[PDB]
């Protein structure tokens, strides 16, 4: 029951000589005054596009969405400035229509240049692409089932082959998701590659498999860290969630660090079960401490036997955590990395999420298969510059969370085997 | 095991003279300042009666309604609720265009003492859900250190945090996590919920079945995995039906629903129903029609009669809704979370009203039956047999993760 590796990509197509190619891609860029902030997420799908046009496909349509509009064409979040983006990109003029669906759609498409490229309107600006909306009211409102059901059809005769590049929307049941019934149905090589590293890092993995967790909730995580629990053999805790282990599992004092009152409730199941599933779990053994929340404050190092004083906070690991990396990391063959293990924004508590990022750097040389997942910890690596020494950096963000918690991605499953 | 442990306004002793800020679901229906149904707001009035009558200094209440994404929006303000407030109360009610700072916490204390506060939209603040939009439509972070800070400026409106939310208890929200009051409990919305929830989930009287329907076994995957470790039956109608009998028994379904994605997993299903004991029930029989509406035309047909090509599944057949007796009314709990067919087209309703009707009658007959989605919800209302079912869940969005396996953080947040 793998579902990760076995789906067909773009790369294992013979077929696709004058046929017309549907295109789902994640355009959900940053946009000010009519011009798009960052590009990397149009820049991505370049790979796909190039390539539909080198096999000889008919005409490369493209539907995406920008933003939640919930139902309603609203003025924010119209994607034709993607379109003035692209034109540069691609060096060809690309056609832009008003809607996703319907006549002037379908004939606009079979009148523009043989091997040429469409981009569609945001598809969430029809309540049955997420089979829900809002009004102009503010109410929530739910589409027909009809409507939905005519609207992946109307999506399906659009083309004769579907490709799927949007990987951080393979979560949500969608239409554009999992309405699109054509015959032939395949990953892109940006949902191929996303596909290909979590197959590595999830279906019989390399091991030893560590995750490497992090962030300020435990609550928000439970899901995550329980299912993981299952696939790895090692796990770092650390981040804010670090102090609501330490003040169940030792009752450690840690002053006015982040405590985590309902995450707190699932510490001891947690530990039952990374010991009855063979999890060797890692926490920090010292801290660095702050006396106000501030970059400026006062700081110091405890360990976890000292415990944090009152009116301090701890807000990174402290040397000793960091030394206690190595062994974890430059020893494992896979690695999963989703948290950051410090206030890093903060330069004087950057310092243990940037080992940690120095060691994952390493081991990757070594050999091992490194993963970033979410988007703080993409930050960080952003920031570093250090994207292309990590085996893969996650850019979905809601799905790999997702599929790191155990769930099935229904966009995945509609790809053809 | 989190749901049957938690403090609830029953087993307060010290309400009196005590400032009780109180979480509530007021997310409502409204047109041009005119709200459209005022259930969600009539469920909160034996929480407030309750907290009136005990002796409350103030009554302070904070809620959201849509999402306005940490932008003030006036289409989502809260003000029109106290103005419904006081219609129901018999009283003014204070209504601040603020929930946090001093300005905030000076016109609560200045208040008629045994008052009742509204404050405003939660979701104003980004701090709230710690992610928001800006007025251009990019999605947006909100600071740590502000996070920590709105979470205290809300923990010093009152002494005795209160929620009576469920329905957003699924999310680790500020106003469902962050309240760290030394008294945290349950309103009698959120006590009821979790008292039929703990009683199904965690100490259930067998069997126990799950009635489970819909268009899509995509979504549903999770429900139906997690369920499978809780359940001794299971029903599954409505869509997904055509989708397991395509791939299980390679019967010819013409022109019905068939999930793609769903197909790939049908066969796993079955198995882990098989090896944890769980008895399966899937139609045996369909009414089909030529068109996906109510005026086309309509015959029966059976397992081995397959669906005539141009032919839809839309409602099970009647040796199919016969089934259902045996299964429903030999259980002792019942969870329903999905319609057996296209319930509101008339023609091919009678199968989700059927299973109403048996579900009902197995209520009057001892078990403790549970009513979860939305569209589940929306029958037994058009019906209206609210009353008829032991509990009818507001969450939608909790009680699916609650049936998914899931933790509630706003649960985990409550004292014991």
């Given at each position: 029951?793998?579902?990760?590796?076995?789906?067909?990509?773009?790369?294992?197509?013979?077929?696709?000589?004058?046929?017309?190619?549907?295109?789902?891609?994640?355009?959900?860029?940053?946009?000010?005054?009519?011009?798009?902030?960052?590009?990397?997420?149009?820049?991505?799908?370049?790979?796909?596009?190039?390539?539909?046009?080198?096999?000889?496909?008919?005409?490369?349509?493209?539907?995406?969405?920008?933003?939640?509009?919930?139902?309603?064409?609203?003025?924010?979040?119209?994607?034709?400035?993607?379109?003035?983006?692209?034109?540069?990109?691609?060096?060809?003029?690309?056609?832009?229509?008003?809607?996703?669906?319907?006549?002037?759609?379908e004939?606009?498409?079979?009148?523009?240049?043989?091997?040429?490229?469409?981009?569609?309107?945001?598809?969430?600006?029809?309540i049955?692409?997420?089979?829900?909306?809002?009004?102009?009211?503010?109410?929530?409102?739910?589409?027909?089932k009809?409507?939905?059901?005519?609207?992946?059809?109307?999506?399906?005769?659009?083309?004769?082959?579907?490709?799927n590049?949007?990987?951080?929307?393979?979560?949500?049941?969608?239409s554009?998701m999992?309405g699109?019934?054509?015959?032939?149905?395949?990953?892109?090589?940006l949902?191929?590659?996303?596909?290909?590293?979590?197959?590595?890092?999830?279906?019989?993995?390399?091991?030893?498999?560590?995750?490497?967790?992090?962030?300020?909730?435990?609550?928000?995580?439970?899901?995550?860290?329980?299912?993981?629990?299952?696939?790895?053999?090692?796990?770092?805790?650390?981040?804010?969630?670090?102090?609501?282990?330490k003040?169940?599992?030792?009752?450690?004092?840690?002053?006015?660090?982040?405590?985590?009152?309902?995450?707190?409730?699932?510490?001891?199941?947690?530990?039952?079960?990374?010991?009855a599933?063979?999890?060797?779990?890692?926490?920090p053994?010292?801290?660095?401490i702050?006396?106000?929340?501030?970059?400026?404050?006062?700081?110091?190092?405890?360990?976890?036997?000292?415990?944090?004083?009152d009116?301090?906070?701890?807000?990174?690991?402290?040397?000793?955590?960091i030394?206690?990396?190595?062994?974890?990391?430059?020893?494992?063959?896979?690695?999963?990395?989703?948290?950051?293990?410090?206030?890093?924004?903060?330069?004087?508590?950057?310092?243990?999420?940037?080992?940690?990022?120095?060691?994952?750097?390493?081991?990757?040389?070594?050999?091992?298969?490194?993963?970033?997942?979410?988007?703080?910890?993409?930050?960080?690596?952003?920031?570093?510059?250090?994207?292309?020494?990590i085996?893969?950096?996650?850019?979905?963000?809601?799905?790999?969370?997702?599929?790191?918690?155990?769930?099935?991605?229904?966009?995945?499953?509609?790809?053809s085997?």
């Amino acid at each position: 029951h793998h579902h990760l590796g076995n789906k067909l990509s773009i790369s294992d197509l013979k077929d696709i000589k004058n046929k017309k190619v549907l295109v789902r891609v994640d355009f959900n860029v940053p946009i000010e005054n009519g011009i798009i902030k960052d590009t990397n997420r149009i820049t991505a799908t370049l790979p796909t596009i190039n390539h539909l046009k080198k096999e000889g496909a008919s005409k490369i349509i493209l539907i995406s969405h920008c933003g939640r509009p919930d139902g309603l064409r609203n003025e924010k979040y119209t994607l034709k400035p993607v379109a003035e983006t692209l034109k540069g990109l691609l060096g060809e003029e690309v056609l832009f229509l008003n809607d996703c669906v319907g006549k002037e759609v379908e004939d606009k498409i079979n009148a523009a240049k043989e091997n040429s490229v469409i981009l569609l309107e945001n598809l969430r600006f029809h309540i049955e692409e997420e089979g829900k909306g809002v009004d102009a009211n503010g109410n929530k409102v739910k589409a027909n089932k009809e409507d939905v059901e005519k609207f992946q059809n109307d999506l399906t005769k659009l083309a004769d082959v579907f490709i799927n590049d949007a990987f951080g929307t393979a979560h949500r049941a969608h239409s554009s998701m999992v309405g699109v019934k054509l015959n032939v149905k395949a990953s892109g090589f940006l949902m191929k590659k996303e596909l290909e590293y979590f197959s590595k890092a999830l279906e019989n993995p390399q091991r030893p498999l560590l995750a490497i967790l992090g962030g300020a909730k435990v609550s928000d995580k439970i899901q995550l860290i329980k299912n993981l629990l299952d696939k790895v053999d090692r796990m770092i805790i650390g981040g804010g969630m670090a102090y609501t282990f330490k003040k169940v599992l030792n009752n450690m004092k840690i002053g006015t660090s982040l405590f985590d009152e309902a995450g707190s409730k699932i510490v001891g199941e947690i530990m039952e079960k990374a010991k009855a599933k063979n999890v060797q779990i890692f926490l920090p053994v010292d801290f660095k401490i702050a006396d106000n929340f501030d970059n400026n404050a006062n700081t110091k190092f405890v360990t976890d036997e000292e415990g944090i004083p009152d009116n301090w906070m701890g807000l990174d690991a402290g040397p000793k955590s960091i030394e206690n990396y190595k062994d974890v990391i430059l020893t494992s063959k896979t690695v999963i990395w989703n948290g950051p293990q410090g206030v890093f924004e903060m330069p004087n508590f950057a310092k243990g999420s940037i080992e940690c990022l120095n060691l994952v750097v390493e081991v990757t040389k070594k050999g091992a298969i490194t993963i970033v997942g979410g988007g703080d910890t993409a930050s960080l690596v952003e920031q570093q510059n250090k994207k292309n020494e990590i085996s893969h950096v996650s850019t979905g963000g809601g799905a790999s969370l997702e599929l790191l918690e155990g769930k099935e991605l229904p966009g995945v499953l509609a790809l053809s085997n």
